[PDB]
Amino acid sequence: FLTAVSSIDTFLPVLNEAKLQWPTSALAASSEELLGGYVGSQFYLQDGKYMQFQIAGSSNRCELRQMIPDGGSEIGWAVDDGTTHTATSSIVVPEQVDGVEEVTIMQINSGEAPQLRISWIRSKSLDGVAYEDFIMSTVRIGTGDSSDNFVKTHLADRTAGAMSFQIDVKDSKLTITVNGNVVVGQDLSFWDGTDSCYFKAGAYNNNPTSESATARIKFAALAWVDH
Numbered sequence: 001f002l003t004a005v006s007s008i009d010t011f012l013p014v015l016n017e018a019k020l021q022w023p024t025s026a027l028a029a030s031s032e033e034l035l036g037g038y039v040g041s042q043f044y045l046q047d048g049k050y051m052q053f054q055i056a057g058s059s060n061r062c063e064l065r066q067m068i069p070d071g072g073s074e075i076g077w078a079v080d081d082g083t084t085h086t087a088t089s090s091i092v093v094p095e096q097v098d099g100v101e102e103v104t105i106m107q108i109n110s111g112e113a114p115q116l117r118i119s120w121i122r123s124k125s126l127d128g129v130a131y132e133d134f135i136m137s138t139v140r141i142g143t144g145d146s147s148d149n150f151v152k153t154h155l156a157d158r159t160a161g162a163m164s165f166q167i168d169v170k171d172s173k174l175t176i177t178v179n180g181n182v183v184v185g186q187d188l189s190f191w192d193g194t195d196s197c198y199f200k201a202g203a204y205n206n207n208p209t210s211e212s213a214t215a216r217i218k219f220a221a222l223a224w225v226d227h
């Protein structure tokens with residue numbers, strides 16, 4: 001018997017502003033269904049306090065997608081609309097099983113390309129330095145595929161305990177704060193006028209080396225706010 005995330009109060013504000021996609025982007029459960037007790041092995045309340053996401057398979061996901069609150073439709077905002085768009089979370093990333101290589105846990109996505117992905121990464125060299133078992137940001141500065149289209153940053157090594165995140169977008173600039181420390185005024189002006197941006201959070205499994213290996217991510221808190 002699995003306990004539903006909506007059975008406690010902690011996540012109700014964000015569930016009232018999200019739909020769930022599982023196991024792919026095109027298969028979704030509405031905000032109303034989430035508030036109404038949606039539960040499964042992919043999305044349940046773990047140890048009485050964690051909104052836990054689980055997913056296996058290449059490019060599969062169990063992920064919340066920002067909606068207009070109170071039964072509204074899909075949100076679309078712009079990096080240059082003058083409003084500050086903020087996402088906060090507290091995440092416990094447990095040890096990922098063999099075959100899981102990268103798990104995107106928060107995003108700014110849009111109808112064009114992902115402006116930002118915060119992901120757990122097993123192993124990567126960045127600007128001549130090797131990092132392992134760590135949290136990375138990937139920001140797009142163009143629409144191409146080569147590395148010049150991205151800015152990748154080591155944010156923090158994965159910790160045993162909960163790790164807090166804050167993503168702030170205002171006036172075409174991005175700030176990321178991890179455990180209260182600023183880790184990224186990153187320019188987003190390439191995306192000026194893109195009116196389809198939205199936040200996501202959960203687990204999106206990228207480039208696994210086993211199709212059966214299950215990514216698993218635990219949220220102690222998640223909120224998205226517009227000021």
Ligand SMILES: O=C(O)[C@H]1O[C@@H](O[C@H]2[C@H](O)[C@H](O)[C@H](O[C@H]3[C@H](O)[C@H](O)[C@H](O[C@H]4[C@H](O)[C@H](O)[C@H](O)O[C@@H]4C(=O)O)O[C@@H]3C(=O)O)O[C@@H]2C(=O)O)[C@@H](O)[C@@H](O)[C@@H]1O
Binds near residue numbers: 107109114138140
């Ligand atoms: O930097 C290196 O050294 C290596 O980079 C390798 O290329 C990377 C890119 O740098 C990006 O990380 C790129 O991110 C992709 C994701 O792989 C994934 O396709 C994602 O998919 C979106 C998609 O838009 C879809 O519509 C839906 O929204 O799901 C996804 C989402 O929710 O975000 O889109 C990202 C993107 O396009 O920005 O991934 C590649 C990669 O191959 O993994 C590579 O060049 C390697 O050789 C380098 O060593």
